Coordinates of N, CA, C and O in Angstrom, one line a residue:
Chain A
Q1 N 18.5 31.9 -4.5 CA 17.6 32.2 -3.4 C 17.7 32.0 -2.0 O 17.7 30.1 -2.2
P2 N 18.0 32.2 -1.6 CA 18.4 31.3 0.1 C 16.8 30.6 0.7 O 15.6 31.4 0.1
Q3 N 16.9 29.3 1.5 CA 15.8 28.9 1.6 C 16.0 28.4 3.0 O 15.1 29.0 4.7
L4 N 17.8 27.7 3.3 CA 17.0 27.7 4.8 C 18.9 26.5 5.2 O 19.9 26.0 3.4
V5 N 19.7 26.5 6.1 CA 20.6 25.6 6.5 C 20.7 24.6 5.7 O 19.9 23.8 5.8
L6 N 22.0 23.2 5.6 CA 21.0 22.1 5.0 C 21.4 21.2 6.4 O 21.0 21.1 7.5
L7 N 21.2 20.8 5.7 CA 21.2 19.6 5.9 C 22.0 18.7 5.7 O 22.5 18.8 5.6
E8 N 21.5 16.8 6.0 CA 22.7 16.1 6.1 C 23.7 15.2 4.8 O 22.0 14.8 3.7
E9 N 23.7 14.2 5.1 CA 24.4 14.0 3.5 C 24.1 12.5 3.7 O 24.2 12.8 2.6
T10 N 23.3 12.1 5.2 CA 23.2 10.7 5.2 C 21.3 10.8 4.9 O 20.9 9.2 4.5
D11 N 20.7 11.7 4.8 CA 19.7 12.0 4.5 C 20.0 12.2 2.4 O 19.0 12.7 2.5
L12 N 20.8 12.4 2.2 CA 21.1 13.1 0.6 C 21.8 11.7 -0.5 O 20.2 11.0 -1.2
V13 N 21.8 10.5 0.3 CA 22.2 8.7 -0.3 C 20.8 8.3 -0.4 O 20.2 7.8 -0.6
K14 N 20.4 8.6 0.6 CA 18.7 7.2 0.5 C 17.9 8.9 -0.1 O 16.8 7.5 -1.1
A15 N 17.8 9.6 -0.4 CA 17.3 10.6 -1.1 C 16.9 10.2 -2.5 O 16.3 10.0 -3.4
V16 N 18.2 9.8 -2.8 CA 18.6 8.9 -4.1 C 18.3 7.8 -4.6 O 17.8 7.4 -5.9
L17 N 18.2 7.7 -3.6 CA 17.4 6.0 -2.9 C 16.4 5.4 -3.8 O 15.4 4.9 -4.5
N18 N 15.2 6.5 -3.7 CA 13.6 6.8 -3.6 C 13.3 7.3 -4.9 O 12.6 6.6 -5.7
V19 N 14.1 8.1 -5.4 CA 14.1 8.6 -6.5 C 14.0 8.1 -7.7 O 13.1 7.4 -8.6
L20 N 15.3 7.0 -7.7 CA 15.4 5.7 -8.5 C 14.0 4.5 -8.4 O 13.9 3.9 -9.7
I21 N 13.6 4.6 -7.2 CA 12.2 3.8 -7.9 C 11.2 4.3 -7.6 O 10.0 3.4 -8.8
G22 N 10.9 5.6 -7.5 CA 9.9 6.0 -8.2 C 8.9 6.3 -7.4 O 8.1 7.5 -7.4
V23 N 9.7 6.7 -5.7 CA 9.3 7.6 -4.7 C 9.7 8.4 -4.5 O 10.6 8.2 -4.2
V24 N 8.6 9.7 -4.0 CA 8.9 11.0 -3.9 C 8.9 11.3 -1.8 O 9.3 10.2 -2.1
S25 N 11.0 11.4 -2.0 CA 11.6 11.6 -1.1 C 10.6 13.4 -0.4 O 9.9 14.0 -0.4
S26 N 12.1 13.5 0.9 CA 11.3 14.7 1.8 C 11.1 15.8 0.7 O 11.2 16.8 1.0
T27 N 12.5 16.0 -0.6 CA 13.2 17.2 -1.0 C 12.5 16.8 -2.7 O 12.5 17.9 -3.2
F28 N 11.4 15.5 -2.9 CA 11.1 15.2 -3.8 C 10.0 15.2 -4.0 O 9.1 14.7 -3.7
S29 N 9.3 16.0 -5.6 CA 8.4 16.6 -5.6 C 7.7 15.7 -6.5 O 8.3 16.6 -8.1
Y30 N 7.0 15.0 -7.2 CA 6.7 14.5 -8.5 C 5.9 15.8 -8.3 O 4.6 16.1 -8.3
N31 N 5.5 15.9 -10.0 CA 4.4 17.1 -10.4 C 4.2 16.3 -12.0 O 4.5 15.5 -13.1
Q32 N 2.6 15.5 -11.8 CA 2.1 15.1 -12.4 C 2.2 15.6 -14.2 O 1.5 15.5 -14.9
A33 N 1.7 17.7 -13.9 CA 1.9 18.3 -15.3 C 2.9 18.4 -16.0 O 2.5 18.3 -17.5
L34 N 3.2 17.8 -15.2 CA 4.7 18.0 -16.6 C 5.4 16.1 -16.6 O 6.4 15.5 -17.3
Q35 N 5.2 14.9 -15.9 CA 5.0 14.1 -15.5 C 7.3 13.3 -15.4 O 7.8 12.9 -16.1
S36 N 7.3 14.5 -13.8 CA 8.4 15.1 -14.3 C 8.5 14.9 -12.6 O 7.9 15.4 -11.8
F37 N 10.4 14.9 -11.9 CA 10.2 15.1 -10.7 C 11.0 16.3 -10.9 O 11.6 17.5 -11.6
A38 N 10.6 16.7 -9.1 CA 11.9 17.9 -9.2 C 11.6 18.7 -7.5 O 11.6 18.7 -6.6
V39 N 13.4 19.0 -6.8 CA 14.4 18.9 -6.7 C 13.8 20.2 -6.1 O 13.5 21.2 -6.8
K40 N 13.8 21.4 -4.4 CA 13.5 22.7 -4.5 C 15.0 23.4 -4.9 O 15.5 22.6 -4.8
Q41 N 14.4 24.6 -5.3 CA 15.2 25.5 -6.4 C 16.5 26.0 -5.5 O 17.3 26.0 -6.2
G42 N 16.6 26.5 -3.8 CA 17.4 27.2 -3.9 C 18.3 26.3 -2.7 O 18.9 25.4 -2.5
Chain B
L1 N 12.0 8.1 12.7 CA 11.4 7.4 11.5 C 11.8 5.6 10.7 O 10.4 4.9 10.5
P2 N 12.6 4.9 11.0 CA 12.7 4.0 11.4 C 11.4 3.3 12.3 O 11.3 1.5 12.0
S3 N 11.1 3.6 13.8 CA 9.9 2.8 14.1 C 8.4 2.7 13.9 O 8.2 2.0 13.3
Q4 N 8.5 3.9 12.8 CA 7.9 4.7 12.2 C 7.5 3.8 10.8 O 6.0 3.5 10.7
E5 N 8.3 2.9 10.2 CA 8.6 2.3 9.4 C 8.7 0.8 10.0 O 7.9 0.4 8.7
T6 N 9.2 0.1 10.9 CA 8.6 -0.7 11.1 C 7.5 -0.7 12.0 O 6.6 -1.1 12.0
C7 N 6.3 0.6 12.7 CA 5.2 0.4 12.3 C 4.7 0.6 11.6 O 3.7 -1.0 11.6
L8 N 4.9 0.8 9.9 CA 4.6 0.1 9.4 C 4.5 -1.2 8.5 O 3.1 -2.5 8.5
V9 N 5.7 -2.1 8.5 CA 6.2 -3.2 8.6 C 5.4 -4.2 9.4 O 4.4 -5.2 8.3
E10 N 4.8 -4.0 9.7 CA 3.7 -4.1 10.5 C 1.9 -4.5 10.6 O 1.2 -5.8 10.2
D11 N 1.4 -3.5 10.2 CA -0.3 -3.5 9.6 C -0.1 -3.9 8.3 O -0.6 -4.0 7.3
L12 N 1.3 -4.0 7.4 CA 1.3 -4.9 6.0 C 1.0 -5.7 6.4 O 0.3 -6.3 5.7
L13 N 1.8 -6.0 7.8 CA 1.9 -7.6 7.4 C 0.1 -8.7 8.1 O 0.0 -9.7 7.8
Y14 N 0.0 -7.6 8.5 CA -2.2 -7.6 8.4 C -2.8 -7.6 7.9 O -3.6 -8.5 8.0
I15 N -2.2 -7.0 6.5 CA -4.0 -7.1 5.4 C -3.2 -8.4 5.0 O -3.8 -8.3 3.7
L16 N -1.8 -8.8 5.1 CA -1.6 -9.9 3.1 C -2.6 -10.9 3.9 O -2.8 -11.7 2.9
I17 N -2.5 -11.1 5.7 CA -3.6 -12.4 5.5 C -4.8 -12.1 5.1 O -6.1 -13.6 5.3
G18 N -5.7 -10.9 5.5 CA -7.0 -11.0 4.2 C -7.9 -10.5 6.3 O -8.8 -10.4 6.8
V19 N -7.2 -9.5 7.1 CA -7.5 -9.5 8.1 C -7.3 -7.9 8.2 O -6.6 -7.4 8.2
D20 N -8.4 -8.0 9.2 CA -8.1 -6.5 9.3 C -6.8 -5.4 10.4 O -6.3 -6.2 11.3
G21 N -6.3 -4.3 9.5 CA -5.2 -3.9 10.3 C -5.1 -3.4 11.9 O -6.5 -2.8 12.6
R22 N -3.8 -2.1 12.1 CA -4.2 -2.0 13.6 C -4.1 -0.6 13.2 O -4.8 -0.1 13.3
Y23 N -3.8 0.1 12.2 CA -4.2 1.2 11.5 C -4.4 1.8 10.6 O -4.7 2.6 9.9
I24 N -4.8 0.5 9.4 CA -5.3 0.4 7.9 C -6.1 -0.6 8.6 O -7.0 -1.6 9.0
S25 N -7.5 1.0 8.2 CA -9.6 0.4 8.6 C -10.1 -0.5 6.6 O -9.0 0.6 6.1
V26 N -10.5 -0.9 7.0 CA -10.9 -1.3 6.1 C -12.6 -0.8 5.4 O -13.3 -1.8 6.2
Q27 N -12.8 -0.2 4.5 CA -14.0 -0.1 4.3 C -15.2 -1.1 3.1 O -14.5 -1.4 2.0
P28 N -15.0 -1.3 3.8 CA -16.3 -2.5 2.3 C -17.6 -2.0 1.5 O -17.7 -0.2 2.4
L29 N -17.0 -2.2 0.7 CA -18.0 -1.7 -0.9 C -19.3 -2.6 -1.4 O -20.2 -1.6 -0.4
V30 N -19.0 -3.2 -0.6 CA -20.8 -4.3 -0.8 C -20.5 -5.6 -0.3 O -21.4 -6.4 0.7
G31 N -19.6 -5.1 1.0 CA -19.0 -7.0 2.5 C -17.5 -6.4 1.3 O -17.3 -7.9 0.9
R32 N -17.0 -5.7 0.8 CA -15.2 -5.8 1.1 C -15.1 -6.9 -0.4 O -14.2 -7.4 -0.2
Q33 N -15.4 -6.8 -1.2 CA -15.7 -7.2 -3.0 C -14.5 -6.7 -2.7 O -13.1 -7.3 -4.0
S34 N -14.6 -5.3 -2.6 CA -13.0 -4.0 -2.7 C -13.3 -3.5 -1.8 O -14.1 -3.2 -1.9
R35 N -12.2 -3.6 -1.6 CA -11.7 -3.2 0.1 C -11.0 -1.1 -0.3 O -9.4 -1.5 -1.1
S36 N -11.5 -0.5 0.4 CA -11.2 0.2 0.8 C -10.1 1.0 2.1 O -11.3 1.1 3.0
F37 N -9.1 0.7 1.2 CA -8.2 1.2 2.5 C -8.6 2.8 3.4 O -7.7 3.0 2.6
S38 N -8.0 2.7 4.7 CA -8.2 3.6 4.8 C -6.9 3.9 6.0 O -6.8 3.3 6.8
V39 N -5.4 4.4 5.1 CA -4.2 4.6 6.2 C -3.8 5.0 7.5 O -4.7 6.6 6.9
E40 N -3.6 5.5 8.0 CA -3.4 7.0 9.4 C -2.8 7.8 8.1 O -2.7 7.7 6.9
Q41 N -3.3 8.7 9.1 CA -2.4 10.4 8.3 C -0.8 10.5 8.0 O -0.5 9.7 8.5
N42 N -0.1 10.8 7.2 CA 1.2 10.9 7.0 C 2.1 12.6 7.5 O 1.4 13.3 7.6
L43 N 3.0 12.3 8.5 CA 3.6 13.7 8.5 C 4.7 13.7 7.8 O 6.0 14.4 7.6
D44 N 4.5 12.9 6.4 CA 5.9 12.5 5.9 C 5.6 11.6 4.5 O 5.2 11.0 4.3
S45 N 5.1 12.3 3.2 CA 4.7 11.4 2.2 C 6.2 11.0 1.4 O 5.2 10.0 0.5
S46 N 6.9 10.9 1.5 CA 7.4 9.3 1.9 C 6.6 7.9 2.0 O 7.2 7.1 0.6
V47 N 6.5 8.1 3.1 CA 6.3 6.3 3.3 C 5.2 6.5 3.0 O 4.2 5.2 2.7
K48 N 4.1 7.5 2.6 CA 3.2 7.6 1.7 C 3.2 6.5 0.7 O 1.8 5.9 -0.1
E49 N 3.6 7.3 -0.4 CA 3.7 6.8 -1.3 C 4.7 4.8 -1.3 O 4.4 4.1 -2.5
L50 N 5.3 4.4 -0.4 CA 5.7 3.4 -0.1 C 3.8 2.3 -0.2 O 4.5 1.2 -0.1
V51 N 4.0 3.4 1.2 CA 2.1 2.4 1.4 C 1.6 1.8 0.3 O 0.4 1.3 -0.3
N52 N 1.7 2.6 -0.8 CA 0.2 3.0 -2.0 C 0.9 1.8 -3.3 O -0.2 1.7 -3.5
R53 N 2.2 1.3 -2.7 CA 2.6 0.8 -4.4 C 1.9 0.0 -3.7 O 2.4 -1.3 -4.6
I54 N 2.4 -0.9 -2.7 CA 2.1 -2.3 -1.8 C 0.1 -2.8 -2.1 O 0.0 -3.9 -2.6
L55 N -0.5 -1.7 -1.6 CA -2.0 -2.8 -1.4 C -3.1 -2.7 -2.7 O -4.0 -3.1 -2.4
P56 N -2.6 -2.7 -4.3 CA -3.0 -3.2 -5.2 C -2.9 -4.6 -4.9 O -3.5 -5.8 -5.7
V57 N -1.9 -5.9 -3.8 CA -2.1 -6.8 -3.7 C -2.6 -7.3 -3.0 O -3.2 -8.8 -2.6
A58 N -3.7 -6.4 -1.9 CA -4.3 -6.9 -0.6 C -5.7 -6.8 -1.5 O -6.6 -6.7 -0.9
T59 N -5.2 -5.7 -2.8 CA -7.0 -5.5 -3.7 C -7.6 -6.6 -4.0 O -8.6 -6.7 -4.4
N60 N -6.3 -7.0 -5.3 CA -6.3 -8.0 -5.2 C -6.7 -9.3 -4.8 O -8.0 -10.2 -5.5
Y61 N -6.4 -9.3 -3.4 CA -6.4 -11.0 -2.1 C -7.4 -10.8 -1.7 O -8.7 -11.6 -2.1
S62 N -8.1 -9.3 -2.1 CA -10.0 -9.5 -2.0 C -10.9 -10.2 -2.8 O -12.2 -10.1 -2.1
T63 N -10.6 -9.6 -4.1 CA -11.7 -10.5 -4.4 C -11.7 -12.0 -4.9 O -12.6 -12.9 -4.7
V64 N -10.5 -12.5 -4.6 CA -10.4 -14.0 -5.0 C -10.6 -14.8 -3.7 O -11.1 -15.7 -3.7
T65 N -10.4 -14.1 -1.9 CA -11.3 -14.5 -0.8 C -13.0 -14.6 -1.1 O -13.4 -15.1 -0.5
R66 N -13.3 -13.0 -1.2 CA -14.5 -13.4 -1.9 C -15.3 -14.1 -2.3 O -16.8 -13.8 -2.6
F67 N -14.4 -14.3 -3.3 CA -14.9 -15.0 -4.8 C -15.8 -16.7 -3.8 O -15.1 -17.8 -4.3
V68 N -14.0 -17.0 -3.4 CA -14.1 -18.6 -3.4 C -14.4 -18.9 -2.2 O -14.6 -19.5 -1.2
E69 N -14.7 -17.8 -0.9 CA -15.7 -17.4 -0.1 C -17.9 -17.7 -0.7 O -18.0 -18.5 0.5
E70 N -17.0 -17.4 -1.8 CA -18.5 -17.5 -2.3 C -18.9 -18.9 -3.0 O -19.8 -18.7 -3.7
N71 N -17.6 -19.4 -3.3 CA -17.9 -21.4 -3.6 C -19.1 -21.2 -2.5 O -19.1 -23.1 -2.8
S72 N -18.6 -21.4 -1.0 CA -19.2 -22.7 -0.2 C -21.2 -22.3 -1.3 O -22.4 -22.8 0.2
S73 N -21.0 -20.7 -1.0 CA -22.4 -20.6 -1.3 C -22.7 -21.0 -2.9 O -24.1 -21.2 -3.7
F74 N -22.1 -21.4 -3.2 CA -22.8 -22.9 -5.1 C -22.4 -23.8 -5.0 O -22.0 -25.0 -5.4
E75 N -22.6 -24.2 -3.4 CA -21.9 -25.5 -3.0 C -23.7 -27.1 -3.5 O -24.4 -27.2 -3.3
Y76 N -22.7 -27.3 -4.6 CA -23.7 -28.9 -5.4 C -22.8 -29.0 -5.8 O -21.7 -28.4 -6.1
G77 N -23.2 -29.5 -7.3 CA -22.1 -30.3 -8.0 C -22.4 -29.7 -9.4 O -21.8 -29.6 -10.5
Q78 N -20.4 -28.6 -9.2 CA -20.6 -27.6 -10.9 C -19.0 -27.8 -10.2 O -18.3 -27.7 -9.0
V79 N -18.2 -27.2 -11.9 CA -17.4 -27.0 -12.2 C -16.1 -25.3 -11.4 O -15.4 -25.7 -11.4
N80 N -17.7 -24.8 -11.4 CA -16.7 -23.6 -10.0 C -16.6 -24.3 -9.1 O -15.8 -24.2 -8.0
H81 N -17.5 -25.1 -8.0 CA -17.4 -26.0 -6.9 C -15.7 -26.7 -6.5 O -14.3 -26.1 -5.9
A82 N -15.2 -27.1 -7.8 CA -13.9 -27.8 -8.0 C -12.7 -26.4 -8.6 O -11.6 -26.8 -7.8
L83 N -13.1 -25.7 -9.0 CA -11.9 -24.7 -9.2 C -11.3 -23.4 -8.8 O -10.3 -23.1 -7.8
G84 N -12.4 -23.1 -7.6 CA -12.1 -22.1 -6.3 C -11.2 -22.9 -5.6 O -11.0 -22.8 -4.8
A85 N -11.7 -24.1 -4.9 CA -11.3 -24.6 -4.0 C -10.0 -25.3 -4.7 O -8.8 -25.2 -4.0
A86 N -9.2 -25.5 -6.0 CA -8.1 -25.1 -6.6 C -7.8 -24.4 -6.2 O -6.6 -23.5 -6.4
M87 N -8.3 -23.0 -7.0 CA -8.0 -21.5 -5.8 C -8.1 -21.4 -4.9 O -6.8 -20.4 -4.2
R88 N -8.2 -21.9 -4.6 CA -7.8 -22.2 -2.3 C -6.3 -22.6 -1.6 O -5.9 -22.3 -1.0
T89 N -6.6 -23.6 -3.3 CA -5.2 -24.6 -3.0 C -4.0 -22.9 -3.1 O -2.7 -22.5 -2.2
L90 N -4.2 -22.5 -4.0 CA -3.1 -21.5 -4.8 C -3.4 -20.4 -3.5 O -1.8 -19.9 -3.2
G91 N -3.9 -20.1 -2.7 CA -4.4 -19.3 -1.7 C -3.3 -19.1 -0.2 O -2.7 -18.6 0.4

């Protein structure tokens, strides 16, 4: 399902850097109910 | 975003010394034995979780500084007077 137009590639290499140490980024949402990370679906 | 990050690292630097920060205010529980930090509002939860994992080192620093300044109220000849002054050397 469409959400919106693309972000940048340099925003991607920093968002993967935050999820490795355990910190949510703008695209990552930690869900305590599953103890897992969640990216946006579309 | 990076200017607001260099905003943060100075506000982090203010609470390492035991000093009231710029955008982080300190609410005393009974007189800052345990510090309830009030950090400013977020426009990004990314940097909110970064400062959230830093503040336990100032929570633990607030307890020892409360106790070694309570040793001035312990002003007698006792082993607590020599223990906490050696803790001041670690501080």
